[PDB]
Design a protein around this ligand. Structure first.
Ligand SMILES: Cc1cc2nc3c(=O)[nH]c(=O)nc-3n(C[C@H](O)[C@H](O)[C@H](O)COP(=O)(O)OP(=O)(O)OC[C@H]3O[C@@H](n4cnc5c(N)ncnc54)[C@H](O)[C@@H]3O)c2cc1C
Ligand SMILES: Nc1ncnc2c1ncn2[C@@H]1O[C@H](COP(=O)(O)O)[C@@H](O)[C@H]1O
Lengths: 314, 261
């Protein structure tokens, strides 16, 4: 047995989730006799071998492709060929924006067992069982893969712990398949204020309603010493600038010691940017809103009367 | 020119839903609507039809049973030209890879020049179908597109994908292509009362699995790539509720706030 991990990197830095999957992998394999192969794909992919060379990796495959960074044609080709050349029982991808661009391609093209954004993984006997969400993280769905020599899972980021230490994979090289990709990467693009890396935050979500309602949570925040922030919808609508979006695609509020989430439900991608704050207060009218399940204190109530009165005592 | 937009009617549960038996939530606690992503994706196609002095055909297509007609009617009303619903009871419980297949055979008949899909659905959040379509079809693809630069008939197209921590990356892609559209690429419209009304005269077009060359044997949970073993509600938290008044709930927040300064 082998477990195939595929790493992830962008613009020359190895993305942390890579190290998380090795973790996953290692905590999964049934006998320490089983190996864990890790591949890394890119025209300058070499650079990474020092960083990839770490506890848990038995083999490191470096795959020189046509492009520097992710490209769905190149990636599906390479992983297909590694799958062929290693016949893993289980191949693990980071459930990430790159992965979204190819992973389901793989699974479709042959019979592979397939499951995505999985956050618990384990064997029971000779039988792989995986757990992901349902009905908008209102339930867990526990699934299995009858019949499946090989199962491909995309893994949620920040669920699995990486290992401490250095190691010594056998390192190897392949050429990616010769693939004449049907898309071509161009420029990376960015579109003052603060960097919401900072102490105390008040963060509004859809919960608030209408652009006119922001001024009073802007004012609430001014008056507690809080920095106004928000979930994605507020910024999509253009009501606060994209600088103030917490989340998987906005900023991760690293030095936040206090975070009050008002009218934010706690989507997966919001938690991504804030799940590690030590004190999280959540105010929300819907008692089963996911945000409550990582808060320390919860209030169930309208954000509007919690607002005034706060703004009234302060 | 023709743009096919694939759309999903998704379920939300009400508070205090429960479970069968074991293997799903109770059919009663679900409310149906058009997947949030699909608004932006259909808007994007209408945005193309709108901007070009040539004729463009937007058609929406759904794999679902007939509670879905109601969502298709909404697409109709928001500008879409034609609407098609694929169904057989056999199809029930098909995961994203099977829906991929069913969508493909419809897309092979329609012959469109571009296909849009949603980054994900809000219920199952699989984030896999659209790209799966890309695969059976063998078309070029991109997932998670925040901006599209395309003119009907062009043969390359410049998109921007939205990456983690914020950045965007442009990518030039050949067309025909599939792309899965992200929230925020645009501000989708609301139907007008006239829209609602004319749409009420349109047909939603029924297509069965045999019409696309498929049978009981190609679809539904049995030919999916994952089998449900069971669902369950997760225990939800170790957190402290505060009960009582505004003056109190708020008095507490202010204690905590102050405990931190
Ligand atoms: C690839 C991708 C990237 C993403 N990136 C991000 C990201 O960076 N950041 C992000 O935030 N999301 C992100 N998401 C978007 C995400 O899926 C959700 O759509 C979003 O996080 C939901 O925002 P919300 O919780 O404010 O809205 P909702 O999910 O609509 O929740 C609103 C909440 O307010 C509550 N409420 C309503 N009225 C009141 C009231 N009067 N008093 C108290 N509570 C009230 C409701 O109970 C509800 O729980 C991303 C999604 C995708 C797939
Ligand atoms: N059953 C379906 N019928 C039509 N389109 C669908 C269906 N399921 C998924 N889709 C497409 O899949 C998208 C993304 O959600 P996901 O099911 O997470 O892959 C939706 O926006 C639709 O484009």
């Amino acid at each position: 047995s082998k477990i195939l991990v595929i790493a992830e990197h962008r613009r020359n830095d190895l993305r942390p989730v890579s190290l998380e999957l090795i973790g996953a992998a290692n905590g999964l394999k049934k006998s320490g006799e089983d190996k864990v192969v890790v591949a890394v794909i890119g025209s300058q992919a070499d650079a990474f071998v020092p960083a990839l060379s770490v506890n848990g990796v038995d083999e490191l495959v470096v795959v020189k492709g046509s492009s520097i960074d992710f490209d769905p044609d190149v990636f599906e080709a390479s992983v297909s060929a590694l799958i062929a050349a290693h016949n893993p029982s289980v191949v693990l991808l980071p459930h990430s924006v790159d992965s979204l661009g190819y992973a389901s391609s793989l699974a479709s093209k042959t019979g592979y067992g397939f499951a995505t954004d999985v956050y618990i993984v384990e064997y029971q006997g000779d039988e792989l069982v995986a757990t992901r969400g349902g009905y908008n993280q209102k339930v867990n769905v526990e699934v299995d893969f009858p019949g499946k020599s090989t199962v491909v899972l995309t893994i949620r980021p920040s669920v699995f712990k990486p290992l401490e230490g250095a190691g010594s994979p056998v390192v190897s090289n392949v050429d990616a398949p010769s693939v004449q990709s049907r898309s071509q990467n161009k420029d990376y693009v960015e579109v003052d204020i603060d960097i919401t890396t900072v102490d105390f935050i008040m963060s509004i979500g859809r919960g608030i309603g209408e652009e006119t309602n922001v001024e009073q949570f802007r004012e609430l925040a001014d008056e507690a010493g809080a920095t106004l922030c928000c979930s994605r919808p507020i910024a999509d609508a253009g009501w606060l600038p994209k600088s103030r979006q917490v989340g998987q695609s906005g900023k991760v509020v690293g030095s936040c010691k206090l975070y009050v989430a008002m009218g934010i439900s706690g989507s997966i991608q919001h938690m991504a940017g804030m799940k590690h704050v030590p004190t999280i207060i959540a105010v929300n009218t819907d008692p089963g809103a996911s945000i409550f399940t990582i808060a320390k204190y919860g209030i169930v109530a309208d954000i509007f009367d919690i607002e005034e009165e706060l703004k009234a005592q302060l | 020119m023709k743009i096919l937009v694939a759309v999903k009617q998704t379920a939300a549960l009400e508070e205090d839903f429960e479970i069968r038996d074991g293997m799903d939530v109770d059919e009663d606690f679900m409310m149906y609507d058009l997947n949030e992503w699909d608004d932006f994706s259909l808007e994007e196609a209408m945005k193309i039809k709108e901007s070009s002095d040539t004729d463009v055909e937007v058609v929406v297509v759904s794999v679902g049973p007939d509670r879905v007609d109601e969502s298709l009617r909404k697409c109709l009303a928001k500008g879409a030209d034609r609407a098609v619903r694929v169904w057989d009871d056999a199809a029930e419980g098909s995961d994203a890879i099977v829906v991929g297949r069913i969508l493909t055979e419809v897309i092979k008949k329609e012959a469109p020049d571009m296909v849009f899909a949603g980054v994900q659905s809000s219920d199952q959040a699989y984030a896999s179908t659209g790209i799966s379509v890309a695969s059976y079809l063998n078309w070029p693809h991109a997932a998670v597109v925040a901006d599209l630069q395309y003119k009907p008939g062009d043969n390359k197209a410049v998109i921007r994908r939205e990456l983690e921590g914020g950045m965007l990356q442009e990518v030039e892609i050949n067309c025909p292509a599939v792309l899965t559209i992200q929230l925020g690429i645009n501000k989708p419209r609301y139907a007008s009362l006239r829209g609602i009304k004319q749409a009420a005269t349109k047909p939603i077009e029924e297509v069965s699995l045999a019409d696309i060359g498929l049978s009981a044997n190609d679809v539904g949970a049995a030919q999916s790539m994952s089998r449900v073993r069971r669902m369950y509600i997760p225990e939800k938290g170790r957190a402290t509720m505060i009960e009582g008044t505004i003056s109190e709930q708020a008095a507490k927040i202010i204690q905590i706030i102050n405990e931190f300064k």
